[PDB]
Design a protein around this nucleic acid. Sequence first.
DNA 1: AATTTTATCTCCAGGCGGTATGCACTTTTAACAGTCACCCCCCAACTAA
DNA 2: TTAGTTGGGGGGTGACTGTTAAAAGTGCATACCGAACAAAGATAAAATT
Lengths: 176, 1066, 326
Amino acid sequence: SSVLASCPKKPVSSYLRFSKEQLPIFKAQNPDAKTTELIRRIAQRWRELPDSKKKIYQDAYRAEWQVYKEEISRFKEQLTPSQIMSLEKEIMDKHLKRKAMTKKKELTLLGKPKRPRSAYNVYVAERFSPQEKLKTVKENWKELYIQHAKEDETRYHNEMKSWEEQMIEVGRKDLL
Amino acid sequence: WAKILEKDKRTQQMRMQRLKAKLQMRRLQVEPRLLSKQMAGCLEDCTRQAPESPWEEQLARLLQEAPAQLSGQQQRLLAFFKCCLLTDQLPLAHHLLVVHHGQRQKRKLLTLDMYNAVMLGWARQGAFKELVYVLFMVKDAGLTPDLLSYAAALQCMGRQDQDAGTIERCLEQMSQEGLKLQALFTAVLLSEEDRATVLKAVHKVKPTFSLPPQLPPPVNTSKLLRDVYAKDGRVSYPKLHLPLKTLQCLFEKQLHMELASRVCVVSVEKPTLPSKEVKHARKTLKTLRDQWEKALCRALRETKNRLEREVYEGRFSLYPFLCLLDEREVVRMLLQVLQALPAQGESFTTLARELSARTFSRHVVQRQRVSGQVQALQNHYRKYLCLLASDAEVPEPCLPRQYWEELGAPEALREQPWPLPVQMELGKLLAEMLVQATQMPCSLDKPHRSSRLVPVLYHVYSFRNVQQIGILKPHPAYVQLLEKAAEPTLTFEAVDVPMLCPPLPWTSPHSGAFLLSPTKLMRTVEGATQHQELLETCPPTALHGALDALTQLGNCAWRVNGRVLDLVLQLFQAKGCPQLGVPAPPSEAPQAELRRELAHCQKVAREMHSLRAEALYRLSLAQHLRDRVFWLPHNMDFRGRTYPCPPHFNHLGSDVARALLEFAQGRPLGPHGLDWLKIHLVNLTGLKKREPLRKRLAFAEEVMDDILDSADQPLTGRKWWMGAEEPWQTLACCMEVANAVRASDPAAYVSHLPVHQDGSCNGLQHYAALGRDSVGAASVNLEPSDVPQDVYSGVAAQVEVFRRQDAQRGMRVAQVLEGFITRKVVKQTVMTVVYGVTRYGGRLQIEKRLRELSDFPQEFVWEASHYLVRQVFKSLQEMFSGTRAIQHWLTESARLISHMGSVVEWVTPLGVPVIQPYRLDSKVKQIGGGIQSITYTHNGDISRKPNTRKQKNGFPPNFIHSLDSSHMMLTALHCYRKGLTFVSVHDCYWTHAADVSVMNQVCREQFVRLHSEPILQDLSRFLVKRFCSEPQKILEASQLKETLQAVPKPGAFDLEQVKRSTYFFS
Amino acid sequence: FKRYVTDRRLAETLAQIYLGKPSRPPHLLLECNPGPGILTQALLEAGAKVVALESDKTFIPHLESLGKNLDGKLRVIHCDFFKLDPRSGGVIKPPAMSSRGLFKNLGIEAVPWTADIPLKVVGMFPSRGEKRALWKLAYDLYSCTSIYKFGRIEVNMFIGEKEFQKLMADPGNPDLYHVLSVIWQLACEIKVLHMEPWSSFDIYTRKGPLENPKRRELLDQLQQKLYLIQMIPRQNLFTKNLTPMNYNIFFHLLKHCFGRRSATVIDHLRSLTPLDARDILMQIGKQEDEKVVNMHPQDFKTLFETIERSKDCAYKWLYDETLEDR
DNA sequence: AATTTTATCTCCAGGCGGTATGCACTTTTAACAGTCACCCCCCAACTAA
DNA sequence: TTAGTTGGGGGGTGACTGTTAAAAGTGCATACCGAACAAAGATAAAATT
């Protein structure tokens, strides 16, 4: 939002120009091709590309880098300090949410046992604007679900006792 | 919800399958990654040859192919790898090695030693795959296999019990490589078990392989020591007065005391009435101590957890050093250190150094206990005690070291000290943990009135000129609480208390003195190692004289005087007596114009408290040893002078410490003992310094009434003794003289009292002996005469004569002072001439006395100081010219040698090599950390330039100090053969009251024999051969040779007259 | 590297500034190192009783010869202002004096702090000893000792560019801010009266005039503005808490605060006093994350007063006499 | 070669701390493009760490 | 005191799969800045012009 008007995006590199001009042509030629082997064949062609194309792509890249450098030098004066603080808080929050995301993904990538379910949750799962219906079922609450919710966790209890066994072997002693 | 549970189980199953797949392709790496492509292919092929891949043939192929100063990081890594062996954590060291070998930048630090250490560690467990991995590493790095690599391979093969073909191939490979099997068994790193297993492996295929035959150690054949070690003669070595069983019991008690590492004594301060406040303070103190213990344990556990992870990520840490000792021991040491802290605080660097020196000692002692040297030491000591026991007979009388060697000396488990950066890092970490983990309530008077907690230790800055110094200071409330509680016990480190059993004989620069605790042979700074290198590089039979003399000095059995201790305690507890040497209690004290009085009054009470606490430790030890027998071991400084190890209570202190000590073994007074006792008493008084022995004896006989009264009623009588120069020793001498005289047979009374025989200006005596100048020699009692000769009086008389002549000629300042020239004015300058005084340092010494002079006008002090200094030096020139020549020659030689870029060294006539450890510290060393950046000096950096200023200043006096130490050593060695108890203080010799004649005769004989040899020419030849003999440089060498080869000529003096000198030692 | 005034017009302007307004005409003027004496004779021609504290033994004869028939006041004492009251030495040599003996000779009397300025001192600072002289004067002022025991004495002197810039540093100029700036702005009202280049003064050596152009070109090379500063002790310096028998804790606090310049004041408070640091910061009216170099000189005085004023805890400071000469 | 500057009595176990700048090397993220894969923001509810 | 399922619809960010290059971090080393307290007369060695 604020970052876009404050400054544009970085220039695309030589290998990126090569991908821009050649890969869509290669993609258009092969209809069933997917991006994995498309990008790998593009890499193969670039490794086979003559050095003249590399040189001209590098010249374009450095011209764009120079014009971006001048644009940035002009831009640093055209932003009022309030926009600077807004940018700083934006990047700080972005870093925090990215770190939270990767920590959550790390935790879930080791097969963490599920948290104990709820009796109302089990009831609404069996019974089944999603927000409207969630509010409806919540206000309505106000198959042995009560015991099964704890029973599942006791069923999951044998997992978490086992879930500590690999971590000490693998070497992640902080989790326990 | 069975479907949901089934779906969750399925997802969990695919998740664990994915984890297994990503694992089978934070563990610890075991297979190295190699830069070389063909070597990587070779390792892959060796792995792929068979699932049960035989590594022995590949090891044989790898071995048979065979195609200056370490940095701080390298030293730290090597120490880490070495400690991981004792700690018994091999996977950690292996993983760190593989990670360092992986990255391009880190692999350049590694050296063959680290590879060898890890290989040996793996071989000790009989493993082959990891050994092959490290062989791959050493081959890929481009290094070469060495003696240690082959030793590790042979040990692994022997432990695994393989067939003889591979052993035959390995041994023949060493033979073709130029490797000697017998040279293998001399490697220091290998232990006894490793050598035994290597021997078994060798014997598997070469049964007729034997170690070199043992030989009796050679005896010293030097010219001076050939008489001491001569086997033809009559020897009566003294024996102790105790049976064997008592000595063995004492040995057991001392062993227990050293294993405990702490000894607690009862405080000697005035006991306090148990009020309510005292009990409340004690309860609060106990609760605080328990809380601190628990918090420190938790903090240490967290710190170890934090430090392990750093190694788990490929960085060097201090995890094994923390894993060396038990948690309880570390916590107890930290608590003791916190308790011992003074109220005024301690420097941060000093605390960091101390906290790492105590960790090493406990580690060494526990290592000895676990390994199994304690039982061997017990057996050997209980067998060797037969030599000193009274009711035991050794087949042949021997010196203690000779007997200890002849019984079969157990091998000493030498322990490697840590490098200086590791010690400093460990100390700083421990100090930071102690600072962080300790907390106390803010308001002690009423708990929970203010619930906030405040630290116990604070980190303040102290400013001196420009420099900052970080200082840890205790909270004042804790100090006041400690003072109010009045704890009744003191705690002493086991190395600060005299031994309760005869000390271990010195048999090598590594072993001796205390039973288990380490002790430097040459006391110096922590990092310096050139002295030890020079000591170890010398032939083994050179240091026999020094070791024997140290052992003889350490075997004297002391005991505590009773009545003197009782009187001192009576004075000390009630009110004190500053005029005698007993500090006054803190209760007795004097207690913008008001600022001046407060500034001075607070200044007075500081040193008053400092002295009282210093004497509290000494007097508490003596009471604890009031019915026991104790010993004091000895060691040397870098020149050769000998000092006792226990610092608190020894005969090198003030008169209060010298009056509480006496020989445990007494001797009959004989026919000429009472006279020596009386002469010693008169000498102690100091009234008749310049009189013959006949007049001293007559004066002693004429005041027998005062002596008897002082011996009868010391504190309520005439109190005559208090006027003496040494009030306290004089009382003990009075008691002994009265007891001897009152006895029925005065010639058969047994006396336990030492008798001193000092030397007047021993440095100048040695200088005059070297220069052979008659005028100088005659003034320091090197010639027979009827009365003592005092050099100070002669110098004062000459200065007064010069002053009278100048006043007759006419001069205002000269005639200003008439009769103001005395011995007291010039005594300090004449005494300090030996230490290279100058015309500038003498001015400040003369002015100090002139200021205290009263009748002298205060407007002439500057001119009087100038005139007196000039006259004193002019008169000194006439008396001693050879001394001036010798001093100039030595100073010039030292300066010229230091300009070439080398520190001076020489050899004493006995054989001990000496070296001067003066270097310039230019680059600064720091340690960044949580609290502060500690600045330390890297001692042991042999690349620093010599300090020319401090090497031309300290050479002339150190030579003389080494000479006098040699003279003392020779005297002690020759006195031992006659059966005498000998204890010396630098240049004062102590013995029983009945052996003074023999000791004087031996002193004179050994002085003449020592100074008859050509000392100066030997020193010049050594200096010429050691330094000048260089072909690379010709001009510096030419100048140095020109200076060195010009030795000053001797005078015309006969050294034989010393044997007829009555007052050479008086 | 002593300096003296030789120009006629510069001396006339300096005398006009020194006399200033004719308010309180009979103001005694102590002259520090008159040297040649053109300044002293200019002040005498202006009509003021001047006494010269000349140091060199060779200058009194000329001063007395010019003032033999002065008929006004040219009392001369062979004394040095910066060498007044040495702290070591049983007897005081003629170049030095005693702060009490000189005033006994001058006949002036002691006066309380609250009253007016009794005397004025003019001169120039040492060439190589600006910091030493400033610290000595601060120690002699904060304890009301030496010349300051006789009242608030005004000091007017010349100073170099670098020392002046360090001395007048403010939280708006944190590069040169230090302790000396704080302890000198807390007690005096510093003013700038005149500006002059180094070329106006003729330098002097031990031998005599330094007429060498090459060394004069060094003066051109070392040409720094020689500012003129006037110092008057503040009336309200000594409160009920900042007594003359208490400044040592203040000096140590200021020294410790500048040991770690780039640190907040909260950690220094935690390492200096056992009281709740946040309470002190709230009482003096500041936030927790306040830097050391963001504190005005009066704020340090306010903080010291706030800490000293409390009575709940017996122990307030960790500074003791043992933290000296360590 | 001459002129100006500096230290001036030894040994017994002593060392300043903080902030700024520079350099040689390694590690990290942002840029492009299409799919798609799982996660995350909402109303409301309950249980564990 | 805070977060995870539960709950679908709707967005979001990155993975997968390539190469590139300009910052960001690391470990080491040197340089400059920070309180006082007299000094007269002497002399040879070390540092500088």
